Amino acid sequence: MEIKETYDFSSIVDLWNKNIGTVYPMNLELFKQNYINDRQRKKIMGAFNGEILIGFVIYKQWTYKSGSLKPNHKIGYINSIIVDINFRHQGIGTKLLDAAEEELINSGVKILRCGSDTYHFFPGIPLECLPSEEFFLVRGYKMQDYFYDLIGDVSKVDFKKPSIKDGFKVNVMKPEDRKGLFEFLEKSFSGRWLEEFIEFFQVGMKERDIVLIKYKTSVIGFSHIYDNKSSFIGPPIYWKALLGHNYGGLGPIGIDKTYRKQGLGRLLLYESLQILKKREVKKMVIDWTEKDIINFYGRFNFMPWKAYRKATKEVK
Template sequence: MRHTFANPDFEALTKLWNEFHPARYAIDEDLLRLNTVQSPVFDWGASSTWWESGQVCGFVAVKKSAVSLYPGPDQDVAHISAIVYRDARIGVDMLADVKMALRNRGISKLVFGQDSRHFFPGCPIDSKALQSFLMVEGFTEGGLANDLERDLADYQNPYPAPIPGATMRYVEAEDLPALTEFMEREFPKRWNYDIAHKVRLEGSTPTVFGLFYGETLEGFALVQQGTARIPIGGAVWRNSLGPNWGSLGPIGVSEHLRGQGAGGALLGAALEQLKIEGVRQCIIDWTSLVDFYRKFGFEVTRQYRTMTLNLESNNGLK
């Protein structure tokens, strides 16, 4: 029987998730609440929990386009933030419901993951059953994204040389106008929104590590650890990273500085800072720059395949 997400048993949903996915994707109840019903783009109409004989046997969490949060995203694209089921038959019924609800609203595309406050940047490639299920349901495959990790216990900065004229330190409250100006000037709107939201809730220290020339910001790295109230990006896998977990990313430097050593120096210093603060297992998420991060001793631990369903084609009409 289908239920809405109003007052669901989050303990039961979390348990079902943790039985469905490999341990490296384990979540906790707080995270499930944060990334579903507490998200401003959670789609209450298309999301559902499914029950049989008084037991939860599946749920699907759908998110709307993030266009209401920042300009840019296509308003006709929706996202499956998560789908979990005891039995593929239930998965098929749940997805049929989602497709119908979205199509009735004129939504043209359904993407697995990549939602605002996402769990997944794509379908985890080690969840073979889920990937096959999505393929059978008409989703098509796109590119690969990677998460990388390392233990910082024995980390040595490969780029310790100072950059002439630059300092690297946390962004402080008085730097916030410079942070806003820099993010708007250089980066995608999604990064700008995510960072501004984090800073509003958690403060800029210890959240944004910056590369400054005087008072001008020319580089940033978002860092998170146990104190983060809203874990985003790689920090959603904090349960698998263990105590003293850390997360870094996104990271970026101004376009005119790229390829001259600034990004390497910033990443090197930010990781050094995390090590000083006691971070051990550290994750860098949703990236294709594997060779760049390998220079810092990071190795790929998770991979995700972009999966998209065109709701306007016959494929999506099942």
């Protein structure tokens, strides 16, 4: 057996699906979109028996800015790691993560994260990969809290419009709103979400995927919505193969801090969901939510669907 770099995307995806495809079905389009467009220092290391790929790890160091966050070179990420089912418990996973980690460490990493990278596949260790928690524990990762993808079928429920206090308008974005939108993000969400707006517009997000809420003329919040016409495969629709015809998604969503807790997030969410409904969306997902916010979406009939555990290793 040898460990060496591979960018044999088909073989990786094939191995991915054979091992975990029932619950994280992967396709080449998503795999390539996410791997190729990422701007971090990144690598894929494979484990090989001769010419046969038997496992891999994808890993990154935070070397590229997130909006007005500077990169923190101390942070590295394990995007994914899978050893083929017929080669488990032979130390291969170990050798792969050793190689990843030693490299990150030599280049200055001191905090190693399970998922949560830019162009992530996973917010953390999936519950479906719960037994890997012990693999990570043994290597010095500590297990922390959970995030959840939520699922709902917006074709099945009708909801009541929240009561519009006046001045506030919710609308699908137009090209000429881009200036205002960026101005709002620099103020309120100037980190990764800003960076995602910039990068997603570059990779095929369209104005139709964005809903804005304005007070008078000022942008004071947004959502990103997805359907089966969206060009960019974002996190809500990663696992669209599980979601049927007329799939969709939503996230992220935010309101200017000074307008919070007046029912405006609820209004934006309502309107975003009506747009999706009108687009004939059925099952749809809201990705990477925290526990404390689940009820916000649950009023609209969304339920936790997948769970992911945050996990972090501090380099000694």
